[model samples]
Target: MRFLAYFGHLNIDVLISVDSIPREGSVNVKDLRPRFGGTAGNFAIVAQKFRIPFDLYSAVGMKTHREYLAMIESMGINTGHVEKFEDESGPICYIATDGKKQVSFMHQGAMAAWAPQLADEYEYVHFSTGPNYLDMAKSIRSKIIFDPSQEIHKYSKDELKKFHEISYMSIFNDHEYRVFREMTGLSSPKVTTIVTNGERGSSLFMDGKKYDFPAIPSSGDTVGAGDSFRAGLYLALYNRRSIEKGMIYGTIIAHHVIDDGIELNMEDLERETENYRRM
Candidate 1:
């Protein structure tokens, strides 16, 4: 039940902290840190950390940027499917967090041109749900998990409904979920919608039953938390764990991301997940 291929964002993240956002003015960040992040890449990191057999399909650029690609590959993410283009510049994201609040700036680059085959032996194929890509993925035999993120607004009512029919699960944050409902007028059942509300835990609507799961509390860089949660959820599903237990597993690992520091180690993640259920 391993995840075979993944298609999503792959970008460099620059974390910054400032006293406040300047209004029609300029201000330097009080602190700056660079880390590797992108929905797909971070998910790959989480997958590898949890000892999941998975491959990533994404676009990578020149030698300088290969560092990130090479790093994830070394961590056992199976980068064989990565599309290497000569394009040196790709998508870039900036995450500004001030402990209590966060803001992001993103530029979708070569990522916008990603259109690949969804045919593979994998049972589950997690995608961020772009219109063309979602259509392509749905055309395949593999199941999909839709994480539209900021792109949820791209599809119309009928289009999102179409996606729910095709995807095995549709994951979105609270804000995106609200916008999706108003725009699509789609109810919860068609797709298993998992609304992750961070510290408030998560809500799952499936089979007409709404379930809420509380997340563990932690502190520090919560950079790749969402991706990690998806990793845990996918792994739980693969193992036939109940959805209720799946949320707990997902939140536990995602919470660990904030406490365990930025550079996740596969061995450590496996160690932690090993005793997850003693019974």
Candidate 2:
């Protein structure tokens, strides 16, 4: 089978819980914590846990948290294309949260320096939100899964249009889709598209019908849920499953990420698809 490749970031995220997201001034901090995360980082971990064959084409810093780099290396996720720079730091996102809401300031770090390399071999390439995505999108020939994520805010109408023009499909949360739909006049898509809703679940708009996938009942850190969901759908597609089955796979894998402490395994996937697998 042809492999899937990810072109995105690797981050050491720091969460700073504060009184509130002020309009102008700063607020007193309530708590601060650092964690492992990034669009590519999250996606690969879920992909690795499920034994999905894939490659990562990004960059990292020599000073990137040693343990973080070690964990990724040990996961057996292919990093042969991951470049290294001694002078730069890997990406870092400092998120300020007010218990229920948050804002972020990201340092592009190594992600900004990863020279655009054509990810030509993979059957599918996920343009996970990060720096210089337009370069990556234009450089690849594979079917594209355009995941604009939070980086949608940084793209111009023309850039956004280019993404839709080159993508095989697009995945967005309800808000990003709104912006994308409006800016690009995405009244209807010619191919499959996914729009995710936290807690309420997700939707696959294809062939003019909206197929809904309900959220699995569980919760913990909501950090990587979307990336895991995308990986799950990709995993299903790799296995030659239908889009409907892909939705189920996506939701289940997403659950494993946020549900915490539950390791993703084949049993859960098989059990979730048991009745449907026969049909």
Candidate 3:
């Protein structure tokens, strides 16, 4: 009850390479690598890697996305909240990441069909504010971390204000931060706002104080760096860890993800954490 996040998002990702996509009127061989990957899922992966306990709440389809539920369950995240819809699940994003640059091709399907289940299941519930706001609002069991993502475009100032009043924090990337600030004209640091900047590090704003985290560099591409960072930060904050130490924890974990292109093992992770403390 003290630390939990109800995560929901489309688990639609198909891996492809530059050579796989078609050219103008040219036939190309398709290499399909369907995987369970959504913003929330990736974040959960990082959280699990750190031995953090959590759950994933998503509405999947019997078709392509039934497998997504299996994948999340295998990751050890609580999948009891997962729903199976008659219709097809969310979009399938074609991602091509060269470990540095990433490209996505998407066709969102059943994501819009999901209705937020109004239940008090978590201490910190993260919900999307795009189509499912009305239901999502009443379901707030505790503090909410609103991630409007694409939903920001759909909500007006008055609409956004409703959630803002109840939101414990808001998460956004660099571009989203600019848009939210411009739209609200209310950049009150009294509320929690986490802005993630890949290799440039990240910043957390709370109670009018902005804390900066130095960029944690890794050897490989920056694929799931933000998700890893958030997992670390969430652990520290939820456990009442010092804000400064929390940032360092997040950055270091992020480094491990980017460098090896995989989660860190215990021994290596411990060594890395010690190095971070010495800095």
Best candidate, TM-score: 2
Tens-place lDDT per residue, model 1, 11-88, is 887789887765567767899977777788788887777677777777656533578877876876666677666764
Query: Least accurate stretch of 10 residues (summed lDDT) in model 2?
Result: 259-268
Can you write out model 3's per-residue Cα lDDT over 1-279, one digit (the tens) per residue?
536755556567787644533435643434547776666777878787777766666666666776676776786877666666776756567786544556687755666566656444567777652255645665565778777765676767765666666788777778877777777777663367778777677888877788777786567866667777778777776667776666777888788778766635656655776787776
Quote each prediction's TM-score. Answer: 0.82, 0.86, 0.82
Better of 1 and 2 by lDDT: 2
Residue 254 of model 1 has an lDDT of 88
Better of 2 and 3 by TM-score: 2
lDDT values, one for every candidate: 0.74, 0.79, 0.68
lDDT of 1: 0.74
Candidate 2 Cα misplacement greater than 4 A, ranges:
16-32, 96-103, 260-268, 275-279
Q: Mind sharing the TM-score for model 1?
A: 0.82
> What's the TM for model 3?
0.82
- True-structure lDDT of candidate 2: 0.79
